[PDB]
Amino acid sequence: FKIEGRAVVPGVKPQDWISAARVLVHVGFLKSFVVHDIPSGSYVVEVVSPAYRFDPVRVDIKMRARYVNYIKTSEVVRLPYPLQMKSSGPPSYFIKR
Amino acid sequence: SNGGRIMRSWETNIGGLNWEITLDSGSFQALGLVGLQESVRYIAVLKKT
């Protein structure tokens, strides 16, 4: 089976950072986003980037990704369709004085 | 890759993939790049079956 996805940034002209993406969960790459030849179950995927942040998504594949919370196994927040991720700016690893 | 199963093409400029597909089960005896009379439209795969 497989996993379709889009992985977008607001205005940052994606192509450049495509050189440093490697989606984990089975590994996939960018173009858009596809992961071939997996089994069916409850898998949590994330879009790795070293200079960006992407919130993970918990697919429970018929495809439905509801939410990752890790506390309450039984929960449904019904995310519509594949892995929209909102590219929440640059993560702040540096700290001021 | 993967013993004949998976096939990918890249761009060689930025690292930007352009298309990936998957094949049947085999052993990948060999691969070639065929063109008919003046162009190279097609590619060929041989997997022992």
Cβ count within 10 A of residue A23: 22
Resolution (A): 3.4
Task: Fill in the amino acid letter for B1.
Answer: S
Q: Which residues of B touch A29 (CB under 8 A)?
A: 17, 20
Q: Which residues of B touch A14 (CB under 8 A)?
A: none
**Inter-chain touch B20–A34, beta carbons under 8 Å:** yes
* Cβ pair B33, B49 in contact under 8 A: no
User: Cα separations (Å) of A18 from A9, B19, B30?
Assistant: 11, 14, 31
**Inter-chain touch B14–A34, beta carbons under 8 Å:** no
Q: From which experimental method does this structure derive?
A: cryo-EM
Per DSSP, what are the bridge partners of residue B42? B34
Cβ count within 10 A of residue B10: 13
Residue from B20, B23, B24 to probe the interface with A (highest A Cβ count within 10 Å): B20
Q: Which candidate, A6, A11, A10, places its Cα nearest to that of A21?
A: A6
